[PDB]
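Limitations
The C-alpha cells in this dataset are predictions for the assembled complex, not deposited experimental models. Users should treat interface geometry with appropriate caution, especially where small molecules or nucleic acid strands are included. An illustrative entry is reproduced here so readers can see what is and is not provided.
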Amino acid sequence: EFRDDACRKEIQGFLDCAARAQEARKMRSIQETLLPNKLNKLLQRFPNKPYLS
Amino acid sequence: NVESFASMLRHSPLTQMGPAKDKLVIGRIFHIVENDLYIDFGGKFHCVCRRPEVDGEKYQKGTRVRLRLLDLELTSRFLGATTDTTVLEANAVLLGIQE
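Predicted assembly:
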C-alpha cells in the first residue's frame, strides 16, 4: 500500500542505483575529455589531394 | 679513370640489400623525444620507435641499434587521391642495442 515500512530495502536500492547512475554519468563525461577534433587535426596535416601539384 | 654513377649505384650497400621487407639494418638514434627515438639507418627517411620498456635508459643519442625494416618509406594511395600520401618515415621494428 505504498507504505515505506517494508519498502525500506527497495527504496534504499533505488536511491543507491540513482546515485550510481549519476556518478557514472559524471565519470563518462570527464573520461570523454581518438576524438574527432584530434583526428581531424591529424588529417589536416595530410590532406587528400584529388588534384595535381 | 672515374667510376660511373651506374657502377656506384650497382655496388652501393643499399642496392646490395634486396627488398627492405624484414631485412636487418643498423640504425643510429639521431634524435630522441621523451619516449620516441628517431633512428636513422642509412635510408632516405628515418624510423620512429618507442623507447623499449626494458633498458630504455640505455638508449641515447648516437646509440647504435638493430632494426628489422618493414618499409623504407611509409606511403599509400587513398580513395580519390591522385598521388600516394607519405608519412616521410620508414617502418622498422626496434630489436635492441648493438655492440
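Some entries come with short summary sentences. For this one: DSSP finds two helices and seven strands in chain B.
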